[model samples]
Target: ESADLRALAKHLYDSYIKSFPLTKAKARAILTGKTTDKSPFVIYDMNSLMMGEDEVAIRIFQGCQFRSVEAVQEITEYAKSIPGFVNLDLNDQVTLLKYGVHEIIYTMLASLMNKDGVLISEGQGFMTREFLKSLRKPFGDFMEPKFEFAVKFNALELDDSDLAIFIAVIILSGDRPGLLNVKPIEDIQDNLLQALELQLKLNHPESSQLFAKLLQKMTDLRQIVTEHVQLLQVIKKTETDMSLHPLLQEIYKDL
Candidate 1:
């Protein structure tokens, strides 16, 4: 049991952590409000914030989505790479990605977070405390709670190994809406959860409640995703000038 659990955890880490690596120093810099303006790095400042309200809204989401693109793809590919995930109907795959991707996205973001929030574009881009709150309502509200949750969760100091298995649980969730083959997905989730729980035990033996706390963090992520959908709805209803990316649109359509 121990060897299987360790191997599974290592497999997940090797597969995904290399794509978007976050060290404690980088996370700390983000929390401390470090900003940079290197070439190819997008910086959002007061002067550059001259776009129209609708355009700004679109740009903000686009920027966030862009920063998350790699992680999003990693999560999607990781899910499909899992045994039996691709065997499920194509529609089930779509459904899971649609409903579950954002949760995984935000969960992954937790690793990048510190006290204030996370940095985007590899520390060249940051959403300041006031800046994020000042964005149009609903959209702005969408981020604050995530920052709050991340700050508390980051206190646990989980490293890449811990996050690897934890994210597996989020992506393999079988409870997503419209899943036709819940049994297999649920089985996958159960196995991953067991591995995660066991790995957490081995990694954090002194912290007896670490597994339970991480589960609570996942629950918080689910709630954040729910609010995120509502914010997307508000943007759709009132901000006609802005458009969601096709992939994002599809995800929200089912959401």
Candidate 2:
């Protein structure tokens, strides 16, 4: 069981890090329990902030999905001893793991980009509109103009905080389908908007007592959209961006 867990962790790490090679060290740390960026390394120490929570959560689901009698008894006995898992059986463990995985995956989704050869961020303009293109109906024909105004003009005009809020709103309530289609443009906008909003709300004298939690929330939100954007830009530099970088063919070879 232990060996299987380790091997599965390594497999997931390799698949996830190959495309996101820039975060190779972080990804390695997730699979193993150490922190090393060594190329061709197997795994490293897992970080609680990034993959640790999500990996374990997903593992719990796998355990449930294909549980043997021995596996169920072993897992259930382990979970029942802890107060945190008190009154929870092996079945409950599976459900809880699934929920935990969902939560962490959604939270970290903005940080992922260009997996399965698809761009995951919200782009500069009309992304939801573009996504809705598949429906064969003009999104604009049905949605309010205010939404259009919010999606199109806001990126060009708003401060970072509002932009982050806008991205979050769009992703959560926007026209996106399932978790796979998360857009990076939206992630960047949302992070910046959140950072700016927190700075303003907490720093300003007008901040109310109820909204005080916004300070911590904003702080917890990290802005790696820059890295995400940089990776894409690096990939596109020779072809589209102003900067000079390797050709897309070479980048693909690295992958």
Candidate 3:
């Protein structure tokens, strides 16, 4: 059990860091309000602030989806390393990716977060909560919850290894719709749980409740994703100008 746990931890740690969507130093700099641009990295400084229902907001929202293009690739690359993931073939793997990607991204997003906002475009852009809140429905509506989750998530102070275990749990979770065969994941779930639980013990031994909180975040993530899908369905029906990436269309296609 001990040796198995270490290997899983190391595998997840390496995989997560190797393909992490942004450079750690860069993301950290963004989180600390550091930037390479003299121009505001913020998308909504006093100068950029505008109403959400215009073409500019559409562009910004499109740009946000563009970031997910990178994030989804990272999740696919990251998921390839999880043990027993191979049991799910091409279609199933994509199905898993579709459901779990954003939920996992929210966790990854925590690193980009400071109290007021999160950086986007590899720290080239920052969007403040106040700015997002000013936007109209399905625009502001989608982003506000992420900030809420990120703030609570940031408190855990998880590193790459912890993040690995957490993401693994999200992917391997047996309950996602369209996963016809849960046996492979079900069989492997305990292996990850043990590693994740052991991970907290090593990194956060002083906080006994920490493990429970992490799992609760998984619960929270599901609700967030469900709400996200509902928003997408609304977007699909409204015939709006906002565009979705091909993969985003594919991922949320059946959801």
Candidate 4:
């Protein structure tokens, strides 16, 4: 049942994103537009971006590394839990998951973000956007789009239930390369697409164009990922902290 899917997604959000319990309270406060006067905050500084052995560089890279290492597995687990995903060939399954996890990550990131910053350490802390911007070229040049997209995406106010189906649409994309089971993938996609449209209809009746705007964001994700790949190449070219979690490398390898 689509209802069942929403239920699972909410549960996933409660467990995966709501880590530390207080994190949800803070994240919700941020997402709901509550004032963040003294919320626990951290900064995603440029130590990792510039690659130095100082405390900022070392600890920041560790923090960034910690976040990505776990998220990839959790995303794979949740995405595989979708109903029709099991029907695809394992290779096609890999293809779908490999391409879309980062897109899905950005969607979830909005919950932890406000117009100014995002929550880190399971919502125990915030990373201020000003700090990210202060990092100059390597950070702002490559990373501002993350905040830009999140701020606009936050306008949609999608909770975990809607996001579950939305992430499904990204993963089951027919446009992914190396997908052998296009028919099966598209079939699942249409079903999810309808479910997502219906979800937006029920949740956001104030605006008839919510579904259309959401689709536009879906297109926006591709360009974001494309630019991410481009920045990653530059970072790698300079040999600055090129080591990534193997799973991240795998998902990002072909793209």
Q: Which ten residues in a row have the lowest lDDT in candidate 1?
A: 34-43
Model 4: how far residue 139 lies from native, Å: 3.3
RMSD of each: 4.0, 20.7, 3.4, 4.6
Off by over 4 Å in 1: 21-45, 48-57
Model 4 lDDT vs. the true structure?
0.70
Q: Model 2: per-residue lDDT, tens digit, 1-255?
A: 445433433333343333222232233233233533332221122232133223332332233223222223332333233222333344444443322222222222222211111111111111122222222222112212223322333223223223223223222321222223234334433443444444445344354532334323322222222232344444345334233223222322322
lDDT of each: 0.71, 0.29, 0.77, 0.70
Which regions of candidate 3 fall more than 4 Å away from where they truly are?
23-26, 33-40, 49-54
Q: Identify the candidate with maximal lDDT.
A: 3
Give the per-residue Cα lDDT of candidate 4 at 140: 49
Give the per-residue lDDT of model 4 (tens digit) for 123-234: 6566667766665344445557878898889887776667766877888898888889799899878877777777788778887788889988977777888898887777
Give TM-scores for every candidate, taking all chains together and pairing residue i with residue i: 0.84, 0.20, 0.88, 0.81
Model 1 C-alpha lDDT versus the unseen true structure: 0.71
Q: Poorest 10 consecutive residues of model 2 by lDDT?
A: 117-126
lDDT of 3 by residue, 206-226 (tens): 887788889988877777778
**Winner on lDDT (1 vs 3):** 3
Candidate 1 lDDT over 206-249, as tens digits, reads: 98789998888877887888887787778778887875677666
| Model 4 regions more than 4 Å off | 1-26, 30-38, 42-62, 240-242
lDDT over C-alpha atoms for residue 132 of model 4 = 62
Error of 4 at 229 (Å): 1.2
